[PDB]
């Protein structure tokens, strides 16, 4: 439970691939 | 009603100021931000910060349900 | 000293004048001795209350009549010695310069913290103990700020709910500790504490461990740092929101102190 | 070249005349308690003088090493600006604050944020939203229970 919570962000970054799409993803998460 | 937000237009380098917050958490930016690169201790700092907080939450859960069942007897 | 009938030099406005001491007054006995025998004040005799609590002398100005005779305390009276005679000459020269300036002018004419009262009271009593008294804090200063910040975290974080807010709590604790260490030698020191700090730094070099002011000093110098913090922050360029975060952490740390002031601020 | 009164402790005493600034200090009114009769041999640069010749009185390199210094200590980040002024501070006697004595290119500034701060903010705000809706649901449930009990 805890491990997935702390590991969610960089595994999402790994799934995103390109760093520009991850930059826009972090922009989305900031705008929220 | 509603609220609208529009991102700021791009400004040439002679009139555009990029500033770095001193406050890391909860800095109300207008939604207009820039991502800087992230430079091992920070990784474990995040791990304990979730532990503690979730623990406190459990405690917040456990402090209010006891008042609920102690209200039904009255 | 002062004797009955002896010479004295006294204030009168800004200048020094020679006088005879005709009576010597004692405030404790409500009594004075005179020259032609203890006696109290008469029916028409009185002393101004500004000096009557101090030892008074009834004096008569030389070269001036008895209408100028008056009671003077130690503020207005001095013994007739060469130091007083020399400063009498000096003030005579000042009066001479004033008269010369009179001559010159006439000849030209012819041509966001709101802390409660208990922290203020304990800070001003520490001020009285550190300025009007030689007494300073104890060497190890007992409970260090280590303890305060540490438990303060252990209570507030278990009261704080978000992981984000606990990050700001730990961040504020670490920053306050490092600022205490790096600023105690810069502002958080008074008289008869510079020597104590020198003794501390010479003691630290003996056992090869580097010096540190968090554990060494007590929690009251930490409160001194919080007191100087509002004027210190606004000196340089600082944000709006970061400033508000800092005073908010300031205020809830102060009210957490206000929960148990008596733990760290009892004499 | 000298001052009649100590600019740190505000009384007269033994002084050390600095080269550029006319302010002088006592043998203890310094970050370090300089040992009298044992003062290092040299020009006697003070903290202000060492701060000016460290930066060579130019703004660009001083802002760049200030940003480098803030980059080093992100754990004390909100105080990191306040750690810098200290270096350019001549230690002085603790004078009480006044209230203690009693009883436009800046509008479109782009925020430079990092990934970890976005992560912390997102987690903080989702936890806030989730538990305020949970606690308001609990409060409405308790209120409805009290209403049904009273009725
Ligand atoms: Zn001094
Ligand atoms: Zn200097």
UniProtKB/Swiss-Prot annotation, chain A:
It comes from the Eukaryota. Transmembrane segments: none annotated. It is found in: Nucleus. Component of the RPD3C(L) complex composed of at least ASH1, CTI6, DEP1, PHO23, RPD3, RXT2, RXT3, SAP30, SDS3, SIN3, UME1 and UME6. Component of the RPD3C(S) complex composed of at least EAF3, RCO1, RPD3, SIN3, and UME1. Interacts with ESS1 and STB1. Present with 1660 molecules/cell in log phase SD medium. Catalytic component of the RPD3 histone deacetylase complexes RPD3C(L) and RPD3C(S) responsible for the deacetylation of lysine residues on the N-terminal part of the core histones (H2A, H2B, H3 and H4). Histone deacetylation gives a tag for epigenetic repression and plays an important role in transcriptional regulation, cell cycle progression and developmental events. SIN3 also has a RPD3 independent function required for normal longevity. This is Transcriptional regulatory protein SIN3. The chain holds residues 661 to 692 of 1536 of the full protein.
């Amino acid at each position: 439970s805890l491990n997935e919570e702390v590991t969610f962000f960089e595994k999402a970054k790994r799934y995103i691939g390109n760093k520009h799409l991850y930059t826009e993803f972090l922009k989305i998460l900031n705008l929220y | 009603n509603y609220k609208v937000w529009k991102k700021q237009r791009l400004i040439n380098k002679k009139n555009q100021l990029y500033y770095e917050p001193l406050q890391k958490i909860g800095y109300q930016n207008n939604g207009n931000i820039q991502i800087i690169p992230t430079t091992n201790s920070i990784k474990y700092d995040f791990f304990d910060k979730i532990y503690k907080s979730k623990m406190v939450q459990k405690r917040k859960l456990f402090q209010f349900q006891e008042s609920l069942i102690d209200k039904l007897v009255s | 000293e002062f004797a009955l009938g002896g010479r004295c030099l006294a204030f009168h406005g800004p200048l020094m004048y020679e006088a005879k001491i005709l009576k010597i007054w004692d405030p404790s006995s409500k009594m004075y001795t005179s020259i032609p025998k203890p006696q109290k004040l008469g029916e028409d005799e009185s002393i101004p209350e500004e000096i009557i609590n101090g030892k008074c002398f009834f004096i008569h100005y030389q070269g001036w009549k008895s209408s100028w005779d008056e009671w003077v305390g130690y503020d207005r009276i001095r013994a007739y010695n060469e130091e007083n005679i020399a400063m009498k000459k000096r003030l005579a020269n000042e009066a001479k310069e004033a008269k010369k300036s009179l001559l010159e002018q006439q000849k030209k004419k012819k041509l966001s913290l709101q802390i409660p009262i208990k922290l203020k009271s304990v800070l001003v009593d520490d001020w009285e103990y550190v300025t009007k008294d030689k007494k300073i804090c104890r060497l190890p200063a007992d409970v260090t700020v280590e303890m305060v910040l540490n438990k303060y975290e252990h209570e507030v974080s278990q009261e704080l709910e978000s992981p984000g807010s606990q990050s700001q709590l730990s961040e504020y604790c670490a920053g306050l500790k490092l600022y205490f260490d790096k600023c105690l030698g810069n502002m958080l020191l008074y008289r008869l504490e510079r020597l104590q700090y020198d003794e501390l730094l010479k003691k630290s070099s003996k056992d090869q461990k580097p010096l540190v002011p968090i554990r060494i000093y007590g929690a009251i110098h930490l409160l001194r740092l919080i007191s100087v913090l509002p004027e210190l922050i606004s000196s340089t360029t600082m944000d709006l929101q970061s400033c508000q975060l800092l005073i908010k952490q300031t205020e809830d740390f102060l009210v957490w102190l206000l929960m148990h002031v008596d733990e760290y601020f009892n004499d | 070249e000298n001052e009649d009164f100590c600019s740190a402790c505000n009384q007269s005493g033994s002084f050390l005349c600095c080269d550029t600034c006319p302010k002088s200090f006592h043998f203890l009114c310094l970050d370090p308690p300089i040992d009298p009769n044992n003062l290092p041999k040299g020009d006697w640069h003070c903290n202000e003088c060492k701060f000016k010749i460290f930066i060579n009185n130019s703004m660009a390199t001083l802002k760049k090493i200030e940003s480098n210094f803030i980059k080093q200590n992100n754990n004390v980040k909100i105080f990191a600006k306040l750690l810098f002024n200290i270096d350019s501070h001549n230690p002085k006697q603790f004078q009480l604050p006044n209230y203690i004595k009693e009883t436009f290119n800046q509008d479109f500034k782009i925020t430079q944020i990092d990934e970890n701060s976005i992560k912390y903010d997102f987690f903080d705000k989702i936890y806030k939203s989730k538990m305020v809706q949970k606690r308001k649901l609990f409060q409405f449930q308790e209120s409805l229970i009290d209403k049904l009990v009273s009725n």
